[model samples]
Target: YPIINFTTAGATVQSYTNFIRAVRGRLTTGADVRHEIPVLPNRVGLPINQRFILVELSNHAELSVTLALDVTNAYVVGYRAGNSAYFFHPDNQEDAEAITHLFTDVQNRYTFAFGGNYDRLEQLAGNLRENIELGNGPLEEAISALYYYSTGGTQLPTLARSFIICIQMISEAARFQYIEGEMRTRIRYNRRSAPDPSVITLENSWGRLSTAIQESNQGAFASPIQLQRRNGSKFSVYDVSILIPIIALMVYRCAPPP
Candidate 1:
């Protein structure tokens, strides 16, 4: 037997239940399984009896979730392996008994850390709900596209993550602007498409739009700062409106909107 010194503060049974529900909310509401939400209870890869335990819900006036595995880890491994007497084997007796006796001797020696708890679980809930309202129903497509790019590795690649976050933010803006140009580009904004005749079609004029036009053939490191309509004709979306009115407006308006 080992002494399990655990703390249960800042969270009641209800908090634990709500935490689980929050994870479930993200899981069922179509959050990205890899990036947006990572943990899942169904195939947790932890033993049944020792799966989840509340260990100090608050520390330093902030919510904290931590885990400790002592003799419990040894028991989970052996019991789940369906063999309690593995230590009785001739060659394994000394080593196994030594490990068991060492754990049985000092209770604090076997403790270890495993990440994740209510904090990220709830974050998943919030991120998914907001993303849901913005990206039609779910963040599945945008979030998936994010992973398709090179994101370094597991060590919290901050730069790439920021880029991905920017893409998601801009896409919400994308729905409001370009949804009117082509039938394929159509996207609903507010209660109607950006081209809806019943309301202010703010996106119809080339002067109003500022977000850059995306071209399919551009290589990596492609610049996204293109004007919807402008001078000369390199990557600009040229039109006759820019021919005479553009020259008159060029004198009136000295520069393009940034």
Candidate 2:
């Protein structure tokens, strides 16, 4: 998604597009109608209409704040878009802390979500599912490719791609689930309904239910590395036991099956 993919000799982070891709949704602040005019003393050796330099400085400061808040909102919404479970791994304490630390760094240092009264978060909620589908929270299609490569009952490539994809799928899926939880929690906090702007009732429409449906359909079935649910909740799968031979049976099927 970088507009161009060429290696520059001495690329700086500030000039690199990918360096700022995570702030995609947070970049544009849309139309701001709150422009303020600078006040000047009428007799300060200049006409009221000729305070050009001071006016420019004031406008720059105001626009700067707006942009800063917009970027901050992006990180806030990014965190808000995905759930903690998606970012954190309960099974791995070190990993969980690392994720926490990252978010904390964003909040503390860069002023993530520093100023509010911005509507990007609310606007993002409307098509959040589509965005997730497009990118699958990250590594979305690559995992799908790995899945397809594994499922053909082929030789050599066997479960090679499947193993990698399964791990990614599990991790991404968990985070998306958490994103769903956060979105629902936000919806409840606002006392509002889904983005179609409808009233939500127990039997009417809930964003959580809609998100679950989307996730279920998106997940579909992974035959190569299947998981069994116990009592409709707990699920289990032994990785090495199932994936070893599949590894030896691997195929160079990076392309489609014949």
Candidate 3:
């Protein structure tokens, strides 16, 4: 039988639980999912890890998602920087798994954030450019996917898979960005027409405005640079406000605040 367990170090159980809790807090409060909140749990372990338990907490409405990890590769710069680890099938083939007769059933454990037939967005990001299709249209693809997963997929045609494969062949930011925009557009389309706004009104949106948002923003690339040698960092929310006043002075000064 396969084994399982968890850890309590720089990334502790309480800390991880708290992080998930914090995310729920923000989502309920209508904050951006990417909005950085210190209390949010981002890492499960960093100091030391031997092993941990994998509890799959998925239901009818969501996915099998949990965040936890092993400590072996923790010291690596990429790992320390919070990048997801690479997962390959044991057959020496990428993402391919050998048949196992050791157990009658398969299980999913979230101990190290990578377990059983799962792929990470970070690991897939670069490859997605090469593996996913572009040039023709991305939004169309995302709309297709959202439609698939959201609709119970009984209607997914064979041609749809082939269509996506053709898309996977092209690697370009323009493709990904444009496709992402497609997703947002579809989300807007769905949200707008399908909104149950009998009780939802916000500082920005109109309607009776009483509904939860189902926008799943996922997808991405990068570069390197060299400059003056120095070590320092500063971050503040108020710093963002500084530019707001200047912009308001020049642009919004003529308009009234809603």
TM-score of 2: 0.16
Off by over 4 Å in 2: 1-108, 114-126, 135-172, 175-258
How much lDDT does each candidate structure score? 0.24, 0.23, 0.22
lDDT of 2 at 163: 24
Instruction: List runs of model 1 lying over 4 Å from the truth.
Output: 1-155, 158-168, 171-176, 179-236, 240-253, 256-258
lDDT of 3 by residue, 161-222 (tens): 32232222111111122222332333333322111111111111110110111111110001
Scored by lDDT, the top model is 1
Candidate with maximal TM-score: 3
> What lDDT score is found at residue 111 in candidate 1?
17
**Model 2 lDDT tens row, 1-258:** 111121112323222233222222122223211111111122223332221110000111121000111121121111211111112112344323333433333322222222121133223223322222211212223233322332343222222322222221222212222323323333234332221211111112122222222223222312222232222342332222332211111111122112
Better-scoring candidate (TM-score), 1 or 3:
3
Model 1 C-alpha RMSD vs. true structure (Å) is 23.1
Please report how far candidate 1 places residue 119 from its true position, in Å: 31
Question: How many backbone clashes does every candidate have?
Answer: 0, 9, 19
Candidate 1 lDDT by residue in tens digits, 1-258: 212121123323343334333322322223212112211223223343423221112222222222111211111111000111111111234333333432232223321121222123224334321222222212222233223323232122332232233222221122222221221222222121211221112223223222121111221113332333222233433332222211111101111223
Superposition error at 16 for model 3 (Å)? 24
